[PDB]
Amino acid sequence: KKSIPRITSDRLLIRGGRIVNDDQSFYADVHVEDGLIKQIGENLIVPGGIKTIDAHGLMVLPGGVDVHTRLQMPVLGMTPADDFCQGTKAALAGGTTMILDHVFPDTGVSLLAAYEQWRERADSAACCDYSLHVDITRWHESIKEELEALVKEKGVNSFLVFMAYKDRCQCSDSQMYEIFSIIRDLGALAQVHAENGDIVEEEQKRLLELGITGPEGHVLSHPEEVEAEAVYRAVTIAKQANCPLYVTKVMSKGAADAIAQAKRRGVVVFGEPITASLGTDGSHYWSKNWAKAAAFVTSPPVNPDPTTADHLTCLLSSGDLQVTGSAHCTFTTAQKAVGKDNFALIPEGTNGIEERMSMVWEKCVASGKMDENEFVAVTSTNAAKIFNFYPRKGRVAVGSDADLVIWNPKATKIISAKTHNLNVEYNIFEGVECRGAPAVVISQGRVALEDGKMFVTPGAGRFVPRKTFPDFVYKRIKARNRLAEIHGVP
Amino acid sequence: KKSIPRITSDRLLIRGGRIVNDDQSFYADVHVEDGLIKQIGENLIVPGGIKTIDAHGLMVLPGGVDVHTRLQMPVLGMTPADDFCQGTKAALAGGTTMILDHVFPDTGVSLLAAYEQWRERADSAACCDYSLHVDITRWHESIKEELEALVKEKGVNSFLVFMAYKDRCQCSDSQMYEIFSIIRDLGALAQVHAENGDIVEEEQKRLLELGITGPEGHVLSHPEEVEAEAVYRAVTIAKQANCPLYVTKVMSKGAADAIAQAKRRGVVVFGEPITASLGTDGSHYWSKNWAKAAAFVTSPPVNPDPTTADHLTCLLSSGDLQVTGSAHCTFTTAQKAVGKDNFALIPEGTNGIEERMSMVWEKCVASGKMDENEFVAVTSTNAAKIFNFYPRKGRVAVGSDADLVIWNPKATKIISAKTHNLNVEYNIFEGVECRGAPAVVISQGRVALEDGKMFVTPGAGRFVPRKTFPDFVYKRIKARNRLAEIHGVP
Amino acid sequence: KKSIPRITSDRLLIRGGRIVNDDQSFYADVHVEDGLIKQIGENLIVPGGIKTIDAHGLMVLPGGVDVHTRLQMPVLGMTPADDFCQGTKAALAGGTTMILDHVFPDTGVSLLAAYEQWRERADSAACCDYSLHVDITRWHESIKEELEALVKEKGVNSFLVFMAYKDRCQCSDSQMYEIFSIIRDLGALAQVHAENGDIVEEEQKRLLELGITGPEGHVLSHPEEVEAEAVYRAVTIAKQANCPLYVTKVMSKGAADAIAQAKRRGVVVFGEPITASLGTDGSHYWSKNWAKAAAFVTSPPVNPDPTTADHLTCLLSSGDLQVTGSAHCTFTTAQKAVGKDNFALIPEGTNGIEERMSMVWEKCVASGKMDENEFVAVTSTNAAKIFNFYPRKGRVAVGSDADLVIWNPKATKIISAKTHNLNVEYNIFEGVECRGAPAVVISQGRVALEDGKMFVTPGAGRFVPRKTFPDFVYKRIKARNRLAEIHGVP
Amino acid sequence: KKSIPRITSDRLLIRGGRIVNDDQSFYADVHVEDGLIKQIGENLIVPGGIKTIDAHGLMVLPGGVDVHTRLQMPVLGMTPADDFCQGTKAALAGGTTMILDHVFPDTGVSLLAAYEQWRERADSAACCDYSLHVDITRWHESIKEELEALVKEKGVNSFLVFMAYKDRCQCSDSQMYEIFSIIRDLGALAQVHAENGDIVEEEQKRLLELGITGPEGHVLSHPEEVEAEAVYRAVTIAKQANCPLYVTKVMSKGAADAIAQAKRRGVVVFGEPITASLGTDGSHYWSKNWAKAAAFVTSPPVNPDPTTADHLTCLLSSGDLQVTGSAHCTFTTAQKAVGKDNFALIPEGTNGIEERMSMVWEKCVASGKMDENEFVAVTSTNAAKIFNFYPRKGRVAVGSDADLVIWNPKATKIISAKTHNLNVEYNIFEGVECRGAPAVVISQGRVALEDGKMFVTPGAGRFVPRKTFPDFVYKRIKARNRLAEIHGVP
Hints:
Four copies of one chain form a homotetramer.
Chain A: E1 12-15, E2 18-20, E3 25-27, E4 29-33, E5 36-41, E6 52-54, E7 59-62, E8 64-69, H1 84-93, E9 96-103, H2 111-125, E10 129-136, H3 143-153, E11 158-162, H4 173-186, E12 189-193, H5 197-209, H6 215-220, H7 224-241, E13 245-250, H8 253-264, E14 269-273, H9 275-279, H10 290-295, H11 308-318, H12 333-336, H13 356-365, H14 372-387, E15 404-414, E16 433-443, E17 446-450, E18 453-454, H15 471-486
Parallel strand pairs in A: 1-6, 2-7, 8-9, 9-10, 10-11, 11-12, 12-13, 13-14
Antiparallel strand pairs in A: 1-4, 2-3, 4-5, 7-15, 15-16, 16-17, 17-18
Helix pairs in contact in A: 3-4, 4-7, 7-8
């Protein structure tokens, strides 16, 4: 008698596609087995019976990597309406197969404890693979031990510091310098939420004092100048500390320019525009419909200058902005409405997880500013290299994870709350038409989207641990450490 | 019997000069009486006997206005070596006839009390006219009343805030915003000492930790980036508050560029390069001679990039930097030497009061970057318009004060401690040769310098009170206030 | 018997005004006699009977100096609809009292002959004072003698070179360098019409080839890039030749930025935005109404980017753009309509002479970007200093010409062809509302506008001759000549 | 009886190396067979006997691709001293395994005929693989047929246009636009030699007129401004034509900035700094030793501003400058000396082919500005993608050509004419010390350099034909063509 092992069904054959990686495009068939890309070539020898997808005339590209989601973060006591299960389903529907969610400790909760609560929730509800950033809401004298445990034991290599939310989680410049020096020693990436909280607080007061209580008060109290200044100050502190810097939620021309200028001076810095900053503008804060206007309330806000998106799109093309995220963090109209009488009480956050891939295509590729290969770079590959999971993600290559999008550059879709996969009533991209969309989405070698139908398994998604010292970040950083030593300076 | 009044001897006739104002140059004679310019013209009818100066082939221009001196400020317990009497003598020797000195309250001393101590000392020792800025070293809840008394009663219309000196006189961004809003309401000018004190403090520690205890540790702990960032943050807060901003001690390209960029965006901001930033560079911090190196220790430091001066000179030419000062604040070698073992204990401050006019001429006019008229602008006229004593100063015009320099554009002088009019042993411009120098200096209608000899009267110099709301500053500011009201915003 | 001379009636008393010069504002009465300002003061001793104007609550400022008009230039065989008489009347109605018109020699006509034809026409028809620029349409080997006669005998100190109009009046870079070297030696100002004619010609062909024959073809064939490039190339050649450069018709952000960057590098260059570039945008080229669209056809075109005007207004505020003109050159709808089937046959030119002062006030002063004093600078004073008739014009000062505007900052007017003083049916500012307008206009000491009525005398206007080597331009240029000699280089 | 085929000896095993590609580094062994990389992995199954190289502790990277050589170009009648054989030997000695040489037709010689002369010479003398750019020295009406034959039949996809050499090979702007439109239609890359020839010619005359006949006259007649302006004008014309642009010999900050600004506006443009612009400065033109100074004479010249190299190195780091070349074109002292009495008669050209890899490492990697992966990008990979031979070159990957450098980052070498592999007496990098050098160089799977000894076979090098429409260039270009069609514009 033979005892026969079971062979798992996360196997498929994709025929006829134009494979698009960040370095080149080429024509070949793709054989997936056990959730991995097993062969890439012509006239591939493959088992009969195998699920077969004909990708002819279409592209086969790595699944999107959303570098920023906030699917479980508490905001003014509110739980986001799209939780890990709905968020990751929405992600898959838009061609994203991996998300990086922000762990945000509630008051009194340590970083490790918050990390464990996130893992508990995500491991049982994630429809696609994921990993976690850890947000530092309070500095204290020994939190280096927490950071150290997180990077050595829990597969985390990025932490976020807040320059805003005065009297809550804002850091001082001294504290920032100290945290960035620790992050550097640990081989981790320093993220920032870059707005001057003290200035925001002063404007919010003045505005409320004059009865400007609607959502336009939110954008008015977060002028572009407080983002640009905070980014510049963060860059400055990071540069002095030789700590690699990652600027979250790049919403303005001024913030993006500061990053581009820093890069020209050799600063190790990354910028993250999000779907909202590429896809809409802040004119809607002044909408006669309060609920619509509130739907845009997020920090930094969607910039009211409608030339912003095109500018940000130019800087994705030139390599100054390297990754795209959503910062997806949604609240219903009822949730937003706690701030009906005071914009400062509106829970901040907006949509973007589902629209990211198509909006990036529409703004960048369909416009002629960038090509398909650059598109892969800024939607998966650069993210994978920055956060240290390349080429596991962000590459159609033998041995990589079978997270694949069969992409149709000729498809067009009008975004609407009528058809979106979110638990909220408004979509900040209502009525925007995008060129480019997924035809098929594959996650872990299984079809998640085909012929307009979703096939998801909440809890199938796995945690992806991330080693410290990613080369793409740290080779420069370590050379600069060694030079400082040789030259006897800090 | 007739009772005959005495006619005072502050009268003279200057013949044959090329009068140079900021708007034009022209040939005419100048008649001074009672310390004022009484007539300007050809074939002037004037009393026989009058002291007569032949200015033929030479220029007659307004006396310099040094917008920044620190002749009585205590630094680490040390009193500056050139006090009000020696400082103003040195000023007159270099063609400056008015100084604006900084009142700096010692700990426990109110602004009004410090103002009164400065007036007591300056009124009895000043060789030329003067006025006072008031430095705010501590924020408290009612200091608006002090500021208000100062501008309404004491002829002060400018106050300085520090962004550096952590744990001593550094303000937070909230406090800065609140002070700038008060300064705006009072019609006064907000000056800043623009360096990020928190970052400076962190670098100083790291450097001392590695035993870099010499004066190069001072420049190394105050990199250009902390000046540029602080200037940008100040500009940002000033702009939000609609408060006119004046950046003191512009020493770097980055700081100057930030101001130039702000001006292009319509921000009401002024920049003040000083003699040291136009005349030398920071290579001397690394001098084998400790005493020489220490002589350069001042904050912000003299920039080590030797292309800095030429850049600053370009921005004086383009109108982005509008005034020149000295920040003169000198300490002997023995005084500096308290920091022999720790650069952070070296009292900060350097020379420049005597060399300002000639160094500006040498760098700006003798190079062909600017003309004689622009030279007057950036050495007296702009200062007079900013601080609200135009055309009393900064103009050869009937009714203006007779503060006049007979200027020789062909003279050349090598600066040296061997011939300078200071009480210190080193000169940061040792061996620098400048084209352009005063032949005659007239203060209050009396000759102070002639044929290389000084004629000074300590205590002759008067306090010049300065009204609030100078048009050159505030017309824009007030229009913006009115527009905010019309548009129902802060 | 006494023989009694006649005393002329170009005398008046203006009481109660706020005098506004470029350097300061102040309250005083103004006494005009014989077309000159005779006294400025309080309690002025003046003849009884004198015409008296009460300017209380209003401003008294120098009459505008329009640095660019084209009132007699032939365009595609067409004579402009507003000739010297109508143009200068329209100018006076908008508070401009001096114009600088461009002499443009027809084919076969020498510069001197064209100059004489312009003088003949202008001397008998000008309602206000004027002077003449001379446009060089053809380079030849001995034209230096013409230029020399013009500056030595005919009171001309500015000449214009064309970089556009390929095969007609475009110069090559060699020729430009040679002309600029001659202009420098003569002490004259080199103006440019800065567009790349070769590129324009290639785009015009492509566009006509695809049947884009409407006025939008005109703007499409003159993209912003050809202006910016030509300005940069002109700046470059001027800098190498040490020849002062004046850029006419600054219509784009790119052109203005090039000038601002040049000034920062110490280049002697002036920029001239015009009413059209501050007051409207190029969206109207796409108007369904052909006649409206054609009304905007001029080169360089009105930029389609509607953020342009605000940018140009920022650069007037920062001092990078120093003068304002109209380039007024109007054609009726019938005249424009020769190009009904081919945009390249539409005669180029648009309005602006009447609206310049109010549009500059509206965009610059009423917005809070600039103050009243800066307004005088960029509307009269800087022009007077550049072209060498300061302080005869551009200053309320004793001995200056009595060209004065009693200006009402609170007046508002909607511009319309229904009320304009032009001979054409369209106004490119139709429906634009401006704050700020003249109440009274005085030219040569006589009232030209009062209570909404014009009082003009065609032929009263005089030619104003302009000496070479204006200091405001040439002091820098001559210093640089002397330095080149000292250093043994060109 | 068996008839046995011969197995060629271009086989080897490289063990223990850190493989460095532009996307990642990783540890693996490399098996080469038949001049190709056959396997990459651990525990590779390989024939016994095979030549084996132990690369432990060292890097294995793609051989350099020198995008610019001029080894056979005639200059003032002179043949370069390092011909194809010596040049390619020198290249291999410095870790470059592929060169792109410029075909330059002598007067009266067609492009095809010059191409055939280059192939004849290179095929029999090249020690490494090569390809050819074709320089267009004269525009004529039918030269499109030559260009077309070259790209369809002769494996050429890049052509160079000259903006300098007035009256010899300079193109006008019209001609440039027409050539760029043809190049675009053919799928080829437009290169430029970007200097304003008309301005250069005028300066050269002035300088010779004042007897400045030495080599400093060469740099003085080619100021940075003529490069920056010409690059901007080229960018402008390329953008209007939608033709991809490649700027050769980027020597100045101004030229590099123009390219960086263009990229930010979405222009398809590449920049090529060369060894000389990264490795030395133009102070040497003023050397007391004429022969040394003449050794630097090349166009554009080595910039006299010694901060230039660091700036260019920053822009390689930020991605604005993507490829590095040598422009190697050497002449002996005797050859240079024909210009002993007139700098304009000195044959232009300098060294760099041998030093490129080490100088790029020294300036970019050893300084901490860039990492090893970026180094591969700018020394081989980007070149391969631009000119359409990726991944055949520029990648350690199975199936790619076995052109490999075993690189030692810890080696240091002082460059000297005493040890260089050139036929000239001077080296413009004399005495420069570089970190980083080749230990072993492999070309076509054969060792060319080992233990400091060269092993070369003149004529082994092959011509590498290059298809049109490289994706890395043309995907953007073709999208923009399609958008123009959709929108009915050129």
